[PDB]
Amino acid sequence: EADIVLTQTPSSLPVSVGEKVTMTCKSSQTLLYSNNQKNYLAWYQQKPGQSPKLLISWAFTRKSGVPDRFTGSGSGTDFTLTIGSVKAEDLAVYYCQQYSNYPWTFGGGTRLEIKRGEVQLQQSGPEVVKTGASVKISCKASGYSFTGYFINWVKKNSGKSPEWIGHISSSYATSTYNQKFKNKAAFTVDTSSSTAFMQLNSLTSEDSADYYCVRSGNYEEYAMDYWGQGTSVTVS
């Protein structure tokens, strides 16, 4: 199977406080699993200068604490996120994301522009590295049982869809990679320090980006939920 492409429209949405918005996410392959009739689709919110947050998974299930005014709906290949009455705090890029089949993929996002009228992942600091060199980013987890969860890694560049690099099982230390990054990235975990690592090798200017570690789990918690603060890598 070809990688699943998620297409989001509109690309940007200029709205006012109090206005009702809807945005779409179309999948090139159905995300409806016949076995359980669940849609393997999530919505993430990335506010300016901040890491993404999970809003909704399973197409319509809000993460606890996410306001009522966010509503996810749709099935198969066609999904929508609605905000019943927007606030300035909703200013963000909204990304849909499929976790139906590897590699996991993200849509290109919808930029929402607004006019007036305990789980934590702590990553290492920003890196400046020479071409050809390597770097190892750490991701220290707290506030939950480390081994119960996967640690995902995600690459993000200024105007592009986030890219899922892969994930590692915290219990078994076995990894799944996106083929695009299989020769670039290497995951490890350290159970005794509750810390996940990603080594990036043979660095070029194309590797310059923000990198996040992101937790994901099992069953109801299958989707990526908690993100690290991000780690900037610049290759000079």
Resolution in A: 2.1
Class assignment of domain 3-120? mainly beta
- Whether residue 48 contacts residue 113, with contact meaning beta carbons closer than 8 Å, is answered with no
Across-strand partners of 98? 41, 105
Domain ranges of the chain: 3-120, 121-227
Compute the distance between CA of residue 209 and CA of residue 233 in angstroms, rounded to an integer: 6
Q: Around 3, how many Cα atoms within 13 Å sit in the side-chain half-sphere?
A: 14
Q: Which residues contact 53 (CB under 8 A, 6 or more apart)?
A: 44, 45, 46, 47, 63, 227
CB atoms within 10 A of CB 122: 13
Question: What was the experiment behind these coordinates?
Answer: X-ray
Could you please state the CATH topology (level 3) that the domain comprising 121-227 is classified under: Immunoglobulin-like (2.60.40)
Beta pairing, strands 12-16 & 110-115? parallel
